Design a protein around this ligand. Structure first.
Ligand code: HEM
Ligand code: HEM
Ligand SMILES: CCCCCCCCCCCCCCCC(=O)O
Ligand SMILES: CCCCCCCCCCCCCCCC(=O)O
Lengths: 420, 420
């Protein structure tokens, strides 16, 4: 049983089933599978019992679990993702106060709406693809929502630099570029925070830029302008990432013309309202569940413990299959069908323990992604925006199909689109 | 407009509304009110803008703000409460390192659980009241958590002497007793610290008692053994104080039997454990929010400045309404309702700017209480303990009712309780 790192690069999102299959575990089963990867023992876990385990901070730490080749360029150095104990709780608290606050999310809903409404018209003259153009639109919204005091081009630059990062870090032949993207982005963010603290750059006192500039650590000292800038990115770039979900959502619409028209009816019955449309939210939630984005979640093991008969080791790495539980037939009724009706029946996605496309457990007391609201706020607005008639989504093979073996995958074209 | 010191003694916790009312200010309003008290100009402030102001250490000093009749017996002479500038930052750092460290809080959580679990069993044989008996239990836990090397009698003795202080100070006809209590406690603590420094009494090297005996100031010199004992009390006595919150919490249970049964279910699932129960924790925070303990906070003014049109001058004393802000309908959804559900929606109480029952600014860089963790840890453990069925809280008028004109008020009986 050699190291499974070559298999992970080869299989991509098929790696979870592959290790499951190559271990003799039945299909659709939740049985833990133990295998070596990255020169160490690892156990892939999947299921509701796995989610409760993954977030038991008494047995599961996170620092060092994500390899630096990924955490380095994507999340940045010293980010909230690599923190445990008190230092994390104080950092999440200050960050969930901006992305998880219902008031600030509703403010973002207005920013992302206006930016999208422009594109749908903007495309009519210079059409493009969803992934690239919506990434800029998402970045413009997140930056304006944060109070970033930069020009429009600078906003679009950083937006594409963040979208370029997400496209490159996952491919072994491009991870070197994602390091250059972060190096540039880290410098632009640090300079911004440095000028806010110096008064050269004055921002709104309640803005996200200000709360980042006045960020402090667990010992009560204010973080370095770099870290304050790294963490500002971790509140804007993960929004630019949603353009990949917008691409996936665009494919599902041309594949499900019935639900696409319901959204349309909804937005039509609301005259342009692209936000807070329960139908588009359900479509956005269904896209997050079915389509591949985050393959699995890595975590370290604090002490010798056990999960469902399979024993796991101290200092071991566990992996939570997020694609497998989100589509496990054990936990979902017909997971093969793209059906946003399941998220109109249960709108509170936090009650679904097995719905973990962006994390499980609690968001305030754990590492679960804050701003799933902000993500869906952006994602649902795009579903409503493309639900129109003047918009016709191109359906070439490179527009509708994506590779399951490619990490951070997406339709080749980025899902092209044209508007009349 | 005569001096308002007689009105404060007469009105108690209604004094803030009284000064608000006698100034023509509308009800529930946040308008500052200026009046003379203690032979000097004073301005009562209330609201989020007041909390940010009150802790702007660029405009507000604190030494001399608390009259010696209160600071003297309660906090002790030369305590961290009377410190400004650098000398405070050096002292808080060494003191918040014991009460604000999440690891040490979890250690105290086990002690307060063990001590509370005993009381409910003693009550079966010899029942009493919440205020007095839980004060001893809180003191027994806080002393053992700190590493106090004393017998059971001294632990029980100093604890009741500490609870006696809180009941006696603030009462004009009893403040003389709290001076005698402090003189006794100061001497017992000083003797303890002196024998720890001499090796006559050996304590755990990382215990709170040791970090107090090795306390140093801004001078780089270790504090006098007495002061190390005053500051040791300011990390054990304020825990004995929570028995007043436990008394208030006991009334709220017989007043809200639904949340009481909600906690009961919670503990039953936790297999007896009384700590880290999210339901009991939420119940504990609402008790701290609704019930009167700390009326207002006085502070000195460094330079002439302004708050919402009202000018305040140098050398003035400002008062931050903590009961008025914690129950202002402007800042809370139905603050008249006792609803721990509001603290399940937002568990991070430090993100709530208007929730200031034990301070409002930052705890590490300000004067905010560092024992809010330890406090709720103790208070919620009692909330879980009384949620059982064998526990019957007496509901006579002197058990359920407390005076709002009395300082450091509580039901007269202390909320009596009997268990089968
Ligand atoms: C494309 C949509 C997004 C996806 C797929 C996603 C996914 C994730 C995942 C899987 C985690 C780790 C959860 C865990 O550790 O259990 C995470 C963490 C995080 N996400 Fe997102 N996210 C998205 C959007 C956002 C947005 C819009 C924001 C805020 C602007 C955001 C902010 C964060 C933060 C701050 C963390 C760190 C949490 C912690 O480690 O304590 N994400 N994200
Ligand atoms: C009954 C519950 C408690 C209440 C109502 C309470 C209230 C307060 C208040 C209002 C302050 C001043 C905040 C400010 O200056 O803005 C304070 C300070 C302080 N408290 Fe408490 N407290 C409680 C429990 C505790 C506990 C359990 C501890 C630790 C064992 C503690 C230790 C301290 C210390 C050391 C300070 C000084 C902070 C400073 O002035 O820099 N308190 N408390
Ligand atoms: C062999 C290690 C694999 C472990 C897990 C695979 C890492 C892929 C996870 C993708 C993270 C995507 C985060 C989106 C938001 C952001 O821009 O930060
Ligand atoms: C006339 C001046 C009045 C100003 C405010 C009144 C002072 C009463 C506040 C009581 C403080 C109680 C603190 C409990 C915890 C501890 O033991 O430190």
């Amino acid at each position: 049983l050699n190291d499974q790192l070559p298999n992970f690069i080869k299989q991509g999102y098929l790696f979870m089933s592959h290790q499951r299959r190559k271990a003799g575990v039945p299909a659709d089963s939740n049985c833990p599978v133990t295998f070596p990867v990255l020169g160490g023992r690892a156990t892939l876990i999947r299921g509701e019992e796995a989610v409760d385990f993954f977030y038991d901070e008494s047995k599961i730490s996170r620092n060092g679990a994500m390899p630096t080749a990924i955490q380095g360029p994507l999340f940045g150095d010293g980010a909230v993702h690599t923190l445990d104990g008190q230092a994390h709780k104080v950092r999440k608290s200050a960050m969930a106060a901006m992305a998880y606050d219902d008031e600030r999310v509703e403010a973002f809903r207005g920013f992302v709406e206006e930016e999208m409404k422009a594109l749908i018209e903007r495309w009519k003259t210079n059409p493009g693809n969803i992934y690239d153009d919506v990434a800029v639109a998402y970045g413009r919204a997140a930056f304006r929502w944060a109070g970033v005091p930069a020009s429009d081009r600078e906003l679009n630059k950083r937006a594409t630099q963040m979208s370029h990062l997400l496209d490159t870090f996952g491919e072994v032949k491009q991870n070197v570029l994602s390091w250059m993207d972060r190096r540039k982005l880290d410098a632009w963010a640090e300079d911004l925070i440095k000028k806010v603290r110096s008064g050269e750059l004055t921002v709104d006192p309640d803005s996200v830029v200000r709360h980042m500039a006045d960020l402090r650590d667990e010992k009560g000292e204010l973080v370095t302008a770099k870290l304050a800038g790294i963490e500002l990115q971790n509140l804007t770039r993960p929004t630019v990432a949603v353009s990949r979900f917008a691409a996936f959502a665009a494919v599902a619409m041309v594949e499900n013309p019935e639900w696409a028209a319901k959204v349309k009816n909804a937005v039509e019955d609301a005259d342009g309202r692209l936000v807070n449309i329960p139908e588009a939210v359900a479509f956005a939630q269904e896209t997050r569940r079915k389509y591949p984005f985050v393959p699995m979640l890595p975590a370290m093991v604090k002490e010798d413990t056990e999960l469902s008969g399979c024993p796991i080791q101290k200092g071991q790495r566990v992996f939570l299959d997020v694609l497998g539980t989100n589509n496990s037939p054990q936990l979902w009724n017909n997971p093969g069908e793209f059906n946003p009706q399941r998220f109109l029946d249960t709108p509170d996605y936090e009650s679904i323990k097995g719905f973990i496309p962006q994390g499980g457990g609690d968001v305030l007391t754990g590492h679960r992604c804050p701003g799933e609201k902000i993500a869906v706020a952006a994602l649902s607005s795009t579903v409503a925006a493309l639900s129109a008639d003047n918009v016709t989504i191109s359906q070439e093979t490179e527009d509708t199909t994506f590779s399951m073996t490619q990490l951070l995958t997406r339709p080749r074209t980025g899902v092209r689109v044209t508007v009349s």
